[model samples]
Target: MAEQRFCVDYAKRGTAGCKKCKEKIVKGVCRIGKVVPNPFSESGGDMKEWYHIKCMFEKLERARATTKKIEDLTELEGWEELEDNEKEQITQHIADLSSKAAGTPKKKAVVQAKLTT
Candidate 1:
């Protein structure tokens, strides 16, 4: 079978933090994960890069903005695991996924050249 690079499922445990937001994802929420090449693995196995729905979709938005890779969430592995309501939520956004600016927080550095009178 052809590999599906992404998957969607509920968080099994609440302890794991979102790979994007780096915050604990509550159980029962649909969590999206992209299977990526693992650097830490000596065998070069793939690992899941998990994220909350919003964070996950943002990455998809960015990906489609640059590359021609398919961004359709319905094509993801384990998508059927989501209930009707959950699927609808993703289906609604599938048509138009747009994110221009990066949502990451900007680093704030104290300016060395302070404004002097």
Candidate 2:
């Protein structure tokens, strides 16, 4: 299990890459973050990873299915400062992913059956 949070990068440089997409998180963008047990550290501390807000939504849904819920999200240092558009974007992304997840397997099964026929 991991702790989830949101972040906004103030620095105008592409410093971090999204863990899922491997694309640069451009400056002034909102990103999602997760705090997980440090596999590399012996001291049993937490390490953080960053993802584009949209990129994280897929993982968020997966986590929700297995263990966590939307209410499980934790707050990072600057989460309160996120703009309204950024917040809406995250919400929309989750909706998009949810719809796709719900529909994808049925589409794939149809395709597979056609191929078999």
Candidate 3:
């Protein structure tokens, strides 16, 4: 079985927190965006990093390094989709991480998953 993961901001050490104030954040305000690049991809890129709304635009440099090309994404009835750039950035990062973890030693693999907040 795979590790259980949830959307969270990396800045908060995998827990939810405000980007500007660093205070404990709320769901709608400081929720996960689509796939932003895992700045820590070399360690475990398969997982997508979450960020606050303002944080995403501010950290384009990091996201671009990990992001893939632009692609179409499905939508939900009431939920809004993540920005295209954010999705592209994160999708590529996760794909890379998945490729890295194929058949590797699990116990010592140093996966970023299983630490969701």
Candidate 4:
């Protein structure tokens, strides 16, 4: 597997919107970048895809499950210093997922698989 890394930084003036949400990240707001080798770059340089923190939480959760080297979002670069609201938002999403899971039927997963197949 190619090396994967992450970082959080202020969005630069011309930085693009979150790859998942397509909403502008806005200059100076914290943004997360999941950096990986550029698949299209034959020269093998690094490339990063930026996302707003809320959008990033979902991506990181999926990546942590699929990427062996990424075990936890807290260990990712800049996560420790996340703002209070940012951390709260992450936890809220976790709670939302947990509550939804507990309240819903398991049929959704089976239906999703059937639809895709």
**Best candidate per TM-score, number?**
1
Model 3: lDDT to the true structure = 0.43
Model 2 alpha-carbon drift over 4 Å, by segment: 1-12, 61-64, 72-78, 99-117
Clashing pairs in 2: none
lDDT of each: 0.66, 0.57, 0.43, 0.63
lDDT of 3 by residue, 20-109 (tens): 445554543434535433556486655543455445434543455555322222331112344555556655643443344557533323
Comparing 2 with 4 on TM-score, the higher-scoring candidate is 2
Q: Judged by TM-score relative to the true structure, which candidate is superior, 1 or 3?
A: 1
lDDT of 2 at 10: 39
Instruction: For candidate 2, report its TM-score.
Output: 0.57
Query: What TM-score does model 3 achieve against the real structure?
Result: 0.27
Query: For model 1, how many clashes?
Result: 0
Cα lDDT tens digits, model 4, 16-52, are 7577775877776677677787768687688777776
Model 2 whole-model lDDT (C-alpha atoms): 0.57
Ranking the candidates on TM-score from highest down gives 1, 2, 4, 3
Candidate 1 wrong stretches, greater than 4 Å: 1-4, 39-41, 68-70, 96-117
Report RMSD (Å) for each prediction in the order shown: 10.5, 8.3, 16.3, 8.5
Which wins on lDDT, candidate 1 or candidate 4? 1
